[model samples]
Target: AAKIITIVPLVNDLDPLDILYKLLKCADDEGIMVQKRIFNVHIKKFKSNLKIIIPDMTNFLNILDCAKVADFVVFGLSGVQEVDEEFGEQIIRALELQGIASYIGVISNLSAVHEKEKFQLDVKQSLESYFKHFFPSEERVYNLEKNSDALNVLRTLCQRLPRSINWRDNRGYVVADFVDFVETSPDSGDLVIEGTVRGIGFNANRLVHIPDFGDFQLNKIEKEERQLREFRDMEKEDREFPDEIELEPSESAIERLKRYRGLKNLYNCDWQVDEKRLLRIGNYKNTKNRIIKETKNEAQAIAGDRIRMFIRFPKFLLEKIQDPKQLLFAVYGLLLHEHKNAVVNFSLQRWEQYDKPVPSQEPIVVQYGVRRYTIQPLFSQGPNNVHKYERFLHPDTVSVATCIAPVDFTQSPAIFFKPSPAKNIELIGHGTFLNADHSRILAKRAILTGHPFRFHKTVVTVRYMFFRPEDVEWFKSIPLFTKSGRSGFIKESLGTHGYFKATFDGKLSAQDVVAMSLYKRMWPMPSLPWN
Candidate 1:
């Protein structure tokens, strides 16, 4: 599955060479089979003689030859001084002329130094022009960058390439070496220990006691007789009798005194009292001072422990040159093969809510970051059945649905319990087209299908790019046509985009199947115009 792809480096120094090689090795290790043919030696003539011999009007024969044998061709722009609008047109014209069929990719050197800064213009204009001319029409081109979403897109495009190229590396490619760091696992011993303060001990109490005991007696009172009372009253008419009154302490105050005395007695061996010092300690001044110091120490320890995990993962080093897509496919293939269950489960970003249902009267809108997409349902249900329709709709002001089904162990035993099928089967399904007014677009109905079903319960899916008005008649003639089944429709700004389905069962008649397979063949008809 390895084939030679041409990589042209334009820089004087070998830094680009090193980066390219590292990327290749990373791809190789990750399982992207690639063979490299460096054009650094012939770079001087690449822009001049090669164009004349091959003629920029058609694909460069040399590059095309390499592409024909390889899955994709990677062109390195390490020393690209600048890119102009004409460059994209030239590349497109060349590809058209050479009759090349391989996917095209560009690796720009963002670090290249040039006073004219033409490379910036080249990157911008070349990409814009290439997309305008090539994408969603002929060949797909991807710009490679480190730590960018471009890598993921390139990987997906490679997987979508046709299988007939006989480029043994039908898989994807990767420029893995472009990354400089790899993530490393931390040691178990380096883990941070977390806990909370339980209590603080302050030696605030000193006690001392003098021991003594004494016995006491109380005299009884006697009542005066009538004669003694009369004599006393006659002698003290102007004088008052001795007044007698008793004073007692409050009960609460007495209880508090007793408690204080008990505490003093318990700590009599180490007891002392300082009125002024007691007031300061009672206010928690010393305890607060100790807690502040301990808290600072704990915070510092926690912050230091967290710093270890903050290091970056190193970019993988490349051992060989390979197509970036092939490398990505290899990586994903390894993941899917080695950790199939994990990969399958991890691919989905699970959600439990949505704002709008499919086939709603209103538009479904979804926003992520700065981008917003307004998606209306392709099919609609009866207006009275809001309950049934609401479950299918998203409630987040965005109508979103998972293209992939949930991983169900009971329904899909093959995904977990059994190996994949020996021979892959094609899964097909039909969808209807509807306009904003809920009228069926009978002619533009698309038959969506794909091959290589990984699980028996589910089908791998593909979508049609365009749905012609004439396709509706062909769609109704297909097998397993059920008029009673529930239907949904999809539409874009350009009327009916097409219809899609999750799965379909059984094979159909040849004439009926041809409508679904129409896009599989090349456009403009190879022989008969409507075969």
Candidate 2:
């Protein structure tokens, strides 16, 4: 079958001629089956493909919807004049937000003057100056302007697109299915669960656990039946003609199928539609979901569109709801049991939101002067905080505790994996910011595996954020050790914001925050030598 690759454009003014023209220039004559652009959403199927699905919406967030579903995103950075422009900023945010390591870069409409591979060179020069860490170099960038350039640009991208990325990619058998449809008065636990891989490709064949909803299993693998071409305007992707599919003239269908469907019938699989079966496909049996629950009303998670779901809470959970506060929920998938530990993840936000701005706190990265740099959180070199709920990740792995957002305590006073990697990094994972009105920002590219804290004293004045005046009562007389083994703290706040003081247990000759935080919020850092 012709490969189905999704190309999401990050920049603007791209007419279909921009890509379609290039796609037709060389190679096989894969007819354009359909093409449509609505609300920044332009879907074109030139090859039997994962055609570029860039949305028309002006809001960058809408692009995220496309980002979430695309194989990988393609960016168009034409001129150097606007290198740090909204487009580039959006690209950086998109990569970081989507947890995408990098994206397919293109320098469209280059100044044909003195042109000798000017596209990639100019594009690289401009974007590199801005996205040093996020959008690294060399690999995925393309110069989409010539006769063979278009097909080559997209084909190279499709070739480079990761076939199986961690959880997010097509490889790992993890699928995040939205509640597309529900059963009639479905058991409070029933989800007409969907998985990316169809057929009998089962992982956790019998038991799939929903974070706080308890463990569940196949309540009927929810059959998927195919239908006749409904013209996608349409991109009838499902109806890929065998002739249209660019199979190697040398290989037989059976041989090709047998090739990919290997790895315990996992990796190499038939990409053909089985005309003999009801569900003519190849796929995964597990389904993960992007369920951002808005309330604490767990288990009875009713489903919905971007719009609110018709939450059908059982009488018991409904009765448990105490106030409006108890009605919010944010649903997201966390791979439980097996790979949870191997996967280091967490929620992230700009550091500014969680802490008050500090003068000395510098940009997280000031590589190219101040034109573009990430600001640091006064409390953290990064983020570290908690949320509510509970669950088991291992025999000893389970959420000891959790809280709600806003109700959460965000910081980064310090992470060398102290106090036992801070249980839950063991229950597991807040953010602050540097944007408009301190607008909330969620870092999808969030890194996990750690926490932070701050301290105050006598014959001294320390600094920090997210501390309450009564904080001293908790650390009253405990030992605090800095990186140099300097001990301090267990004092009273000098009637100031997140300020307090106490005499050092010894000479305070250290700089690093002793392995403490959240833990010290109630008690003192008991120098756990075992850690």
> RMSD of each candidate?
41.8, 25.0
Q: What lDDT does the true structure give each of the candidates?
A: 0.24, 0.31
Model 1 spans > 4 angstroms off? 2-19, 25-61, 77-80, 83-92, 113-126, 134-145, 148-158, 163-531
* Clash number for each model: 56, 57
Best by TM-score: 2
lDDT of 2: 0.31
- Candidate 2, residue 217: Cα displacement in angstroms equals 6.9
Measured with C-alpha atoms, the lDDT of residue 121 in candidate 1 is: 53
Per-residue accuracy of model 1 over 404-463 as CA lDDT, tens digit each: 111111111110001113111111111111101111111111233312212234322223
